[PDB]
Amino acid sequence: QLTPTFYRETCPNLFPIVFGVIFDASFTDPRIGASLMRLHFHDCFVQGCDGSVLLNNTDTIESEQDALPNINSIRGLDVVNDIKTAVENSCPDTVSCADILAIAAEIASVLGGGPGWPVPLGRRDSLTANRTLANQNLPAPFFNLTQLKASFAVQGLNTLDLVTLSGGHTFGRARCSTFINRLYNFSNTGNPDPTLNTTYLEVLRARCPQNATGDNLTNLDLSTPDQFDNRYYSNLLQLNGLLQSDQELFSTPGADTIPIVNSFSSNQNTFFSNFRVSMIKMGNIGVLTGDEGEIRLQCNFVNG
Numbered sequence: 001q002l003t004p005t006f007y008r009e010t011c012p013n014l015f016p017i018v019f020g021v022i023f024d025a026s027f028t029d030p031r032i033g034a035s036l037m038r039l040h041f042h043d044c045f046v047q048g049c050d051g052s053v054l055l056n057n058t059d060t061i062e063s064e065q066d067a068l069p070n071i072n073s074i075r076g077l078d079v080v081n082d083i084k085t086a087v088e089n090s091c092p093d094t095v096s097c098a099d100i101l102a103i104a105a106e107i108a109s110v111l112g113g114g115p116g117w118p119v120p121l122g123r124r125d126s127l128t129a130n131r132t133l134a135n136q137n138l139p140a141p142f143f144n145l146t147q148l149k150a151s152f153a154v155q156g157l158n159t160l161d162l163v164t165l166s167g168g169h170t171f172g173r174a175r176c177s178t179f180i181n182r183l184y185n186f187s188n189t190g191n192p193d194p195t196l197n198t199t200y201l202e203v204l205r206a207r208c209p210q211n212a213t214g215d216n217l218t219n220l221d222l223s224t225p226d227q228f229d230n231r232y233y234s235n236l237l238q239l240n241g242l243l244q245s246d247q248e249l250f251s252t253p254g255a256d257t258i259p260i261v262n263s264f265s266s267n268q269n270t271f272f273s274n275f276r277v278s279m280i281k282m283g284n285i286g287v288l289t290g291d292e293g294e295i296r297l298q299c300n301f302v303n304g
């Protein structure tokens with residue numbers, strides 16, 4: 001039974017240590033926060049929030065890091081190991097990698113202006129990984145509302161939960177290819193997605209030609225690119241949602257989620273509160289406790 005003081009005696013100043021690490025790691029990278037959060041997300045949806053995603057390729061394991069949604073996309077496993085190293089120098093093999101990811105996501109929010117909350121801890125690391133599962137569990141951006149809702153149900157999350165965690169896109173980056181299909185030829189129609197702001201449609205065609213020498217980066221939130229706030233929901237009202245799965249929350253005739261987007265864009269505090277709740281719920285998926293699993297000494301390889 002996960003408890004926020006699971007380390008009260010075991011690792012007294014756990015939080016202070018990891019907080020410091022993530023803070024210095026931002027002196028040169030104002031994106032590591034968003035990167036760390038999304039990392040905790042990709043862990044939970046596959047096999048459970050058990051760090052299974054941080055495992056590298058072995059003669060015995062085929063890393064999830066090579067699945068369609070992970071390859072050439074997720075980042076920051078480096079800053080992740082720096083945390084482990086510093087935590088170990090204080091609490092020799094007592095804190096799990098799994099928990100470290102969960103603590104990073106909360107700290108990231110606080111460090112970006114967003115809300116905070118007491119993180120329940122006590123999970124244990126796994127001994128396996130599942131690449132194929134990864135491909136069939138993480139939602140893709142070209143999914144329609146029906147599809148998105150179903151993917152969250154598999155995890156035990158509802159419609160509110162879906163629209164609430166999408167707020168994570170209030171900061172961070174995304175490569176051209178992930179949304180370019182709605183810039184020139186949507187649905188084989190030869191024309192741009194009719195639900196994308198025309199002004200933005202230009203700025204975007206600028207950053208993402210119809211053929212260049214590679215994938216350029218662009219902010220998920222044109223309003224407040226690095227700050228955690230309800231701007232992401234406001235943007236939807238003016239058709240400025242970057243990804244296809246973002247806009248669909250508001251521009252899907254019929255809706256169900258529309259009143260919720262409206263609700264949030266109005267009262268940021270309201271949005272903030274559902275979040276704290278939703279993040280806790282997600283951090284409880286397929287957890288390993290008590291004597292299950294182990295305490296990894298190095299987050300990239302299993303003990304031995």
Ligand code: HEM
Pocket residue numbers: 031034035037038041072073075139140141148165166168169171172173174175178245
């Ligand atoms: C509901 C389905 C979701 C879809 C379809 C989705 C899709 C994406 C895609 C395609 C990218 C960017 C393209 C790339 O860089 O390769 C991305 C980035 C991001 N997503 Fe999501 N995402 C989803 C849910 C979430 C959730 C639940 C969170 C966390 C609460 C989240 C947090 C982020 C962050 C912070 C980034 C950028 C991180 C960075 O800059 O490295 N996403 N997402």
Ligand SMILES: [Ca+2]
Pocket residue numbers: 042043044045046047048049050051052053
């Ligand atoms: Ca996992």
Ligand SMILES: [Ca+2]
Pocket residue numbers: 170171221223224225226227228229230231232
């Ligand atoms: Ca923002």
